[PDB]
Each structure stands twice: as structure tokens, then as C-alpha cells.
């Protein structure tokens, strides 16, 4: 599990690790 | 009104001399029984058929009950069973209630997994590998659904089903410019066995596109987000297993972008057939979808899809919504048509491709590729059909994949037709063993029955005598093994008050795993109807049955 | 000698038409419905009081899903799936001209996944209907030359 950071937008466009 | 019908007799290698002694139950209208006995000499017994047809307002039904109290073959083969009887269950409805109800059952459930091996198969098959019971409520309206099913598959060679699984479906055209659309689905999975883990899914999935179109072109824009929450209990026997431990709680939240747009030239075909159109339309669409690591979820019930050249535009590289490829890809295809002076479509060829500008992963990539390529033009896919004549056809498709190294999966088929009588047909179905190995069990790949894929040649003929005879016969011969798949003749003669036919099958039945070899069944059976001359009946009959092709 | 296509997948004569079938909420009636409003068609109830409008009456559909292939113990290996669908346009004063689409698709069997296959082969009815839908929408111009014609 994680928690989502503040730039929101840009951090649900990204690929996992 | 209600009696007896004309016994039919059969001689199989499974059960040697078979006799039936139809009895006909008019009920009332809307209601008709059947109660067959049937003896069986090899097993030494009679079964006793059920099968009630009715039609009521919630749509039409048919139930099919076989009971056969003991089973002396059965008995040998199974000597410490506690009994021998055998015994199947089948039942049929479908109904669209007042427009807005609808009703579904597909039920089949067998004593035993040898069942279609060993007795007619009238709503079953011994191709088949698993046995489907599926329940089905639905309220559908025109901007609205909701389904309420069940699905549990009793297999034959540990099964999960959905207990129950409801999806809903709401659209919305006018907003603005834009179409919307919402889907979401609530799905509790559950395993036969006391040791899998079970699950409870939530998904939700608004989608929102931009369509624009003219007349030679067309562009869609969607986005679409998808938000699924996983609840996973009995993990305890996985996860004492597995160096990838199952989440009990799963969280996966994801956008999708794509692109799709469309083309169209067209000429004259000047040269070759005045009056005579083409038409040339070029297709592409791009598709995003960030990569999401679900090796923390379980699969239940997603499974990857074939890539035909419809295929290659799909936006879903699995079905379900266990496992959701990540995407960065463009995919081109171009598809030429030929029409006629009188706009009659008479030739279409298709031929796409997919590029990958990234690797598609879901965290769990287990699939055994051929080599390691991950990047660029992997998957192509043709299609083909040509109308040659109003009597001559083909068709054609191939699916090739740079990553199995070999052709993927091909299928071609010629055929004339004069009449529902006469016809004649050349069918070649091909699957490489690299995709046997990819996407089916190991043990698929290591077996002899399975790893050599399919290359497969089939023929079919029918042809009438005198307008009251009728011959067909059908032939399917594999070529890497060089041995009969199938094989059927069928020779009926009708008359004005009645009907005669005969018909001989030799198909495959199951392997042997002692000496390693595949198992034939002979089966000539005659069949006297009270009174067309019965082709597409008798086309219809064995194994792998006829289907028609233009 | 190649150009843009100047005039339109529907006929300019089909622009305003009636859409009527037996299950006008079944999927099949949805793909339609969605493929005419593709084209700018402009759909009417079919108790509308506008004559000299055509009507698309949807007849019933029929899935069938057959073993193309078989392995070597004779289980299906390869299933095939096809869909046939009858309509008919009707231009009022003219005639009435049937039409037909039918649609091939294939998938291969698993047993051991056996639900996920169930869940593939509803996408691939869901795929199937649309393109019948699109096959209907080319045999318009067809019909509009058998209008001509006569
Ligand atoms: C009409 C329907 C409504 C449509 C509305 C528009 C929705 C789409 C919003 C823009 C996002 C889609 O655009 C998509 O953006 C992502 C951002 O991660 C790009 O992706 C790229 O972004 C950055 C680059 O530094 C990386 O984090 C990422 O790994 C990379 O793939 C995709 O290449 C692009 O295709
Ligand atoms: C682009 C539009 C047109 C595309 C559609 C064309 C029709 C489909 C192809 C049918 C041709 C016959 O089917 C074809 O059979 C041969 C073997 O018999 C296969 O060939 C495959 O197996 C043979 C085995 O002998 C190998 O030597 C070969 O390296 C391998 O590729 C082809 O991969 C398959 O496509
Ligand atoms: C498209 C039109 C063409 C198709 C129509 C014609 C249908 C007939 C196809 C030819 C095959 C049928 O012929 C098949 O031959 C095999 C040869 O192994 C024999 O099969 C079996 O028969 C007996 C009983 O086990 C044994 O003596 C024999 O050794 C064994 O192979 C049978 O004679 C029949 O099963
Ligand atoms: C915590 C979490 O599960 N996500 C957010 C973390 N981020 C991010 O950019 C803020 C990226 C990775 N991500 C993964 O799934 C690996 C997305 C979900």
C-alpha cells in the first residue's frame, strides 16, 4: 500500500517502480 | 397427439448395440415432454431421458434429465466406488420479459467428468473440457443496465467462480461535445478448493470521449479511469508457498488515454473493372496506460486475448480486471475494399500492426516468450475475404508475434455453395507450438497431446441424388501427426410421409496414458423421422461441425 | 487516381430514419444505434407522424459457438464463435430490402482458467455486435443503388 503525494495529477500519470 | 415415436438404433464401439424408445407428451401448448428409454448393452442397463420444452412469458426453456441407475463399465473401471450410477442435468433459458427483463440459464452438471466420453452428446460434447452453470438477471433500459449473474464450471481434467457478480452500465450522450459512460461491477470469487484464496472486487470505470467525424475521416479521444479495490482472504496456504506474498487489502487506481483515428480514399478501378470502387482506409490509435505492479493480486479471472487485426486495436490486453497491461503503443492498420458497379463489398483485405514504445507489464509476467524483445513492431495481424462469386468464397486470417519468433496462429477456408445441398468446403486451422507454450498450462507444453499446437486440414461435401437422396461426408486429418481427427458420412433418403437416415462418425475420444496413444469411437447409427433433405442436419452432427462461409 | 471519399457512408436519402427491432434495449439495438449516431444519422420513434422516412427493422440474431479444432485426445483446442444478424430497410413508397451481416471471431479454450475464458468470450460478443453494426451501415449505399435501380 502507499499513500498519494500532493501533486495529484501528475503523480496518477506515472509508472510504478 | 401424444405417443409413441419411431426406436432408433445405433452400434458404438463405447456401449456397442444402443436402442431408443421414444415417448411424446403434448402436456398442453407451450409444453411438450420427452421420455426416452435407452438401452445400453455394453452397460448392460437402461438410461432414462427427460427432456421438457416449455414457453412461458419469461422466454422459452428446455430441461434435459439422463439417469442411468448403475453402469457396469463404469463399475470395472471404478471398482471401489461406492456407486455406479451416472446422471446429467441440463437446462436452457433465455427470455427478454416486457423489454426490460431478462432472463438467462445455461446449466450443465454430470455425475462424473467421463460422462461425454461415454453417452450422446446432444447438450454436451467430449470436445468440451469443463461443464458451464451460469444464472443471469438483468433490467436493461435504454441508458441503463444492471446484471445479476452466477458462474461456476465444473471441470473435467480446483475452478474459481464468481457467487455472484453484478455489473452496472449507465450512458450519457449529450454532455456537451462529449459522450459519457460509467461501468462498474461488485464480484465475490470463490474456489472449489478450502486452500485458494478468495476474493471480493469493487471496480468503477467513468469514461469520457470526444468523437469527431466527416466524410472521408473520423478522430475519438477517450479517457477513461478505472479505480478496482481488492479484498483477499485464505492467503495463509499462497502465502506459506510463494516468495510473492498476496495483499489482503489491494488498492489499484489508473487512467487510460487513447486515440483513435480513421481514413478514406477512394478510386476507380479503371483498368481492371470499370465501375468497380476501392476504397483504401488507413487506422491508428494510440494507447496509454501507466504501469501498475499487481503481483499482490491474485488472477481469477483474466486471461490474455487473441490479437486478430480487430484485436489490435482493442484497449485490453487481458480480459477481467485482475491484470491490466501498462500501455505506451501505436497501433497502424490499413484495410483496402473492393466494391461492385452495384456498391456490393466484394473483396476486403486488412493488414495491422502494433508498436510498442515501452514494455507492457502487470508485475506478474510469467508467460514464456521465445526471446526477449520488449520494444517496437511485436504483434502483426492480416485478414482477408473475398466473395470470388455468388457461389465461391475464401477467407483468411494470420496473427504473427516477433516474440514467439513464428507465425502465431493462422486459419484459412475455401468453399463453393450452389444450395443448402450442395456445397463443398476447404477449411486449414494452425497454431504454432510457441503459442501453446505461451499462453496455455506447462503441462500443455510438456504433454503429447498438446505441444505440438494444431495443423489441422478439414473437408466437407454434400451433394443431393435424384431430389431425394442426400450425401454428405466430412474429413478432418491432423498433418503434424498424420492421423485422422475426424471423420463423418451421412446418406439420407426423404420421401413425402418419411425420412431414413444413416450415419457412420469416427472421431477422437481421449488419450491413453499408458501406451500414449489417442482413443477412437465408431458410432453407425440409423434414424426414421415421420414426414428438405436433412444436409444441414447431418452437416451438423459430428465433432467438429460445419459452419458456412459464403 | 486517389481521393478523399466525398460523400457520406450513409445516404443522404437515410439521413432521418426509424430504428425498430424486437429487443430495442439488447445489445444488438445499442451497437446500431451508436453506429448510426456515428454517421450523423438522426434516429426517429416508429410512431412519428413524418412520412417518407426508411425504416431499419432489426431481425433476431443468432450466436453460435462451435470447435474449430481439436488436440490430439479430442478435446477442443480452438473454439469459433460466429454471429448472423438480419435487417430489413424499408423505404416506404419504394420496397423493402433485406440485409444480413455475419461475424467470425475465435479464441482458444482453458480449462484451468475456465471463468476467465467465460469472461473473454462476453467481450468478444461485446466486440462482435459492433461489428455487425458496422456491416449493416455498409450494406446502406447498396440498398440505395437497388433503389436507383428499380
Ligand atoms: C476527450 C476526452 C478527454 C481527454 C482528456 C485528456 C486526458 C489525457 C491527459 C493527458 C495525459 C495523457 O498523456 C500521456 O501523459 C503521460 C504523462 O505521464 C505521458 O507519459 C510520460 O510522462 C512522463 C514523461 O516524463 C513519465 O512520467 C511517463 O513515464 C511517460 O510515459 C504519455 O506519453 C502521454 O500519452
Ligand atoms: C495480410 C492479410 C492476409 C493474411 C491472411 C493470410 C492467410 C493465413 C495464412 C494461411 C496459410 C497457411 O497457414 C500456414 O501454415 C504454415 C504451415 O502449414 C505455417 O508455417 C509455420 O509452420 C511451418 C510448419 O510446416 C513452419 O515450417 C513455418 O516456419 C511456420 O511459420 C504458417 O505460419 C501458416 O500461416
Ligand atoms: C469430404 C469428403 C470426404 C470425407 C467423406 C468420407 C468419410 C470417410 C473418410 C475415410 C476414413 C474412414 O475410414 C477409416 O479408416 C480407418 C483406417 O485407419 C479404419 O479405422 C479402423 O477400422 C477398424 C476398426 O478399428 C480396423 O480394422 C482399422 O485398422 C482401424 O483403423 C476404418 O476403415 C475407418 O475408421
Ligand atoms: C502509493 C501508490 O500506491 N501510488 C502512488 C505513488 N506513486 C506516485 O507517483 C505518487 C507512483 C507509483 N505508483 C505505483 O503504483 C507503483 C502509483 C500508486
Redo the contacts between chains.
Keep these: 500500500?502507499c499513500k498519494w503525494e500532493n501533486d495529484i495529477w501528475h503523480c496518477?500519470?506515472?509508472?510504478?517502480? | 397427439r401424444s405417443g409413441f415415436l419411431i426406436p432408433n438404433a445405433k452400434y458404438t464401439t463405447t456401449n456397442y448395440f444402443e436402442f431408443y424408445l421414444p415417448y411424446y407428451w403434448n402436456i398442453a401448448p407451450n409444453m411438450d415432454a420427452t421420455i426416452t428409454p435407452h438401452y445400453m448393452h455394453r452397460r448392460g442397463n437402461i438410461m432414462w431421458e427427460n427432456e421438457f420444452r416449455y414457453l412461458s412469458q419469461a422466454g422459452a426453456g428446455l430441461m434435459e434429465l439422463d439417469y442411468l441407475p448403475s453402469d457396469k463399465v463404469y463399475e470395472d473401471e471404478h471398482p471401489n466406488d461406492d456407486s455406479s450410477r451416472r446422471w446429467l442435468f441440463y437446462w436452457n433459458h433465455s427470455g427478454?420479459m416486457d423489454?426490460?427483463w431478462r432472463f438467462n440459464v445455461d446449466y450443465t452438471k454430470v455425475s462424473d467428468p467421463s460422462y461425454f466420453n461415454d453417452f450422446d452428446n446432444k447438450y454436451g460434447?467430449?470436445?468440451?473440457?469443463?461443464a458451464?452453470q451460469?444464472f443471469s438477471v438483468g433490467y436493461?433500459?435504454?441508458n441503463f443496465?444492471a446484471t445479476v449473474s452466477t458462474?461456476q464450471?465444473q471441470?473435467?481434467?480446483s475452478?474459481?467462480?464468481?457467487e455472484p457478480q453484478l455489473d452496472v452500465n449507465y450512458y450519457q450522450?449529450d454532455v456537451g461535445p462529449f459522450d459519457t459512460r460509467i461501468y462498474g461491477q461488485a464480484v465475490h470469487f470463490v474456489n472449489t478448493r478450502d486452500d485458494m484464496p478468495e476474493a471480493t472486487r469493487v471496480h468503477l470505470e467513468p469514461t469520457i470521449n470526444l468523437?469527431l467525424?466527416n466524410?472521408?475521416?473520423?478522430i475519438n479521444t477517450e479517457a477513461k479511469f478505472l479505480a478496482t479495490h481488492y479484498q483477499q482472504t485464505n492467503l495463509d496456504w499462497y502465502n506459506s508457498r510463494n516468495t510473492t506474498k498476496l495483499?489482503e487489502?489491494?488498492?489499484r487506481?489508473?487512467?487510460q488515454f487513447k486515440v483513435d483515428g480513421k481514413?478514406?480514399?477512394?478510386?476507380?478501378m479503371?483498368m481492371l473493372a470499370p465501375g468497380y470502387t476501392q476504397?483504401?482506409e488507413p487506422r491508428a490509435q494510440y494507447l496509454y496506460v501507466?504501469?501498475?505492479?499487481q503481483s499482490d493480486i491474485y488472477?481469477?479471472?483474466?486471461?490474455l486475448?487473441?490479437s486478430?487485426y480487430?484485436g489490435l486495436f482493442?484497449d485490453?490486453t487481458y480480459?477481467?480486471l485482475d491484470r491490466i497491461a501498462?500501455a505506451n503503443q501505436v497501433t497502424t492498420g490499413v484495410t483496402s475494399r473492393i466494391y461492385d458497379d452495384?456498391?456490393?463489398?466484394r473483396f476486403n483485405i486488412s493488414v495491422g500492426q502494433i508498436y510498442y514504445f515501452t514494455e507492457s507489464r502487470t508485475?506478474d509476467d510469467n508467460i514464456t516468450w521465445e526471446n526477449d524483445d520488449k520494444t517496437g513492431s511485436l504483434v502483426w495481424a492480416g485478414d482477408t475475404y473475398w466473395r470470388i462469386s455468388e457461389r465461391w468464397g475464401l477467407?483468411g486470417g494470420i496473427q504473427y508475434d516477433t516474440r514467439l519468433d513464428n507465425v502465431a496462429?493462422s486459419?484459412s477456408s475455401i468453399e463453393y455453395r450452389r444450395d443448402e445441398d450442395r456445397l463443398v468446403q476447404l477449411n486449414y486451422?494452425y497454431?504454432s507450438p510457441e503459442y501453446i507454450q505461451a499462453?496455455?498450462?506447462k503441462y500443455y507444453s510438456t504433454a503429447?497431446?498438446?505441444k505440438?499446437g494444431?495443423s489441422?486440414v478439414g473437408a466437407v461435401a454434400s451433394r443431393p441424388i435424384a431430389d431425394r437422396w442426400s450425401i454428405v461426408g466430412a474429413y478432418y486429418y491432423?498433418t503434424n501427426?498424420n492421423?485422422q481427427?475426424?471423420s463423418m458420412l451421412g446418406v439420407q433418403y426423404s420421401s413425402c410421409c418419411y425420412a431414413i437416415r444413416v450415419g457412420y462418425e469416427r472421431?477422437?475420444?481421449?488419450?491413453d496414458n499408458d501406451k500414449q496413444h489417442?482413443?477412437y469411437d465408431n458410432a453407425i447409427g440409423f434414424n426414421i423421422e415421420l414426414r428438405g433433405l436433412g444436409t444441414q442436419e447431418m452437416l451438423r452432427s459430428n465433432?467438429?461441425?460445419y459452419?458456412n462461409?459464403? | 487516381?486517389?481521393?478523399?471519399?466525398?460523400?457520406?457512408?450513409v445516404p443522404s436519402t437515410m439521413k432521418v430514419m426509424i430504428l425498430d427491432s424486437g429487443?430495442?434495449?439488447?445489445p444488438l439495438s445499442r451497437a446500431v444505434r451508436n453506429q448510426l449516431?456515428?454517421?450523423?444519422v438522426e434516429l426517429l420513434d416508429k410512431e412519428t407522424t413524418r412520412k417518407d422516412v426508411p425504416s431499419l427493422r432489426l431481425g433476431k440474431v443468432s450466436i453460435?459457438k462451435?470447435?474449430?479444432?481439436?488436440?490430439?485426445?479430442?478435446?477442443?483446442?480452438?473454439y469459433?464463435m460466429?454471429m448472423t444478424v438480419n435487417a430489413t430497410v424499408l423505404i416506404p413508397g419504394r420496397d423493402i430490402y433485406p440485409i444480413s451481416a455475419?461475424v467470425?471471431?475465435?479464441?482458444?479454450?482453458?480449462?484451468?482458467?475456465?471463468?476467465?475464458?467465460?469472461?473473454?468470450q462476453?467481450?468478444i460478443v461485446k466486440?462482435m455486435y459492433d461489428?455487425a453494426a458496422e456491416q449493416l451501415i455498409?450494406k446502406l449505399?447498396?440498398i440505395?443503388?437497388?433503389d436507383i435501380?428499380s
Aim: charged share 25%; aromatic share 10%; proline share 5%.
Design positions: 500500500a496518477m500519470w506515472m509508472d510504478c517502480a | 427478454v423489454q426490460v460434447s467430449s470436445t468440451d473440457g469443463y458451464t451460469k436493461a433500459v435504454q443496465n458462474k464450471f471441470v473435467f481434467s475452478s474459481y467462480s464468481a450522450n468523437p467525424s466524410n472521408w475521416g473520423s495483499d487489502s489491494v488498492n487506481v489508473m487512467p481514413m478514406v480514399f477512394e478510386r476507380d479503371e476504397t483504401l501507466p504501469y501498475r505492479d488472477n481469477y479471472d483474466s486471461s486475448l487473441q486478430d480487430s482493442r485490453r480480459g477481467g501498462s452495384a456498391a456490393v463489398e508485475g477467407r496462429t486459419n486451422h497454431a499462453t496455455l498450462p503429447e497431446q498438446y505440438n494444431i489441422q491432423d501427426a492421423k481427427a475426424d472421431k477422437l475420444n481421449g488419450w489417442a482413443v465433432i467438429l461441425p459452419q462461409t459464403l | 487516381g486517389w481521393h478523399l471519399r466525398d460523400t457520406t457512408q429487443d430495442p434495449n439488447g449516431r456515428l454517421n450523423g453460435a462451435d470447435t474449430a479444432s481439436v488436440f490430439r485426445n479430442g478435446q477442443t483446442a480452438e469459433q460466429i455475419k467470425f471471431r475465435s479464441f482458444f479454450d482453458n480449462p484451468q482458467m475456465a471463468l476467465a475464458k467465460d469472461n473473454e462476453d467481450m466486440e461489428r455498409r449505399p447498396s440505395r443503388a437497388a435501380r
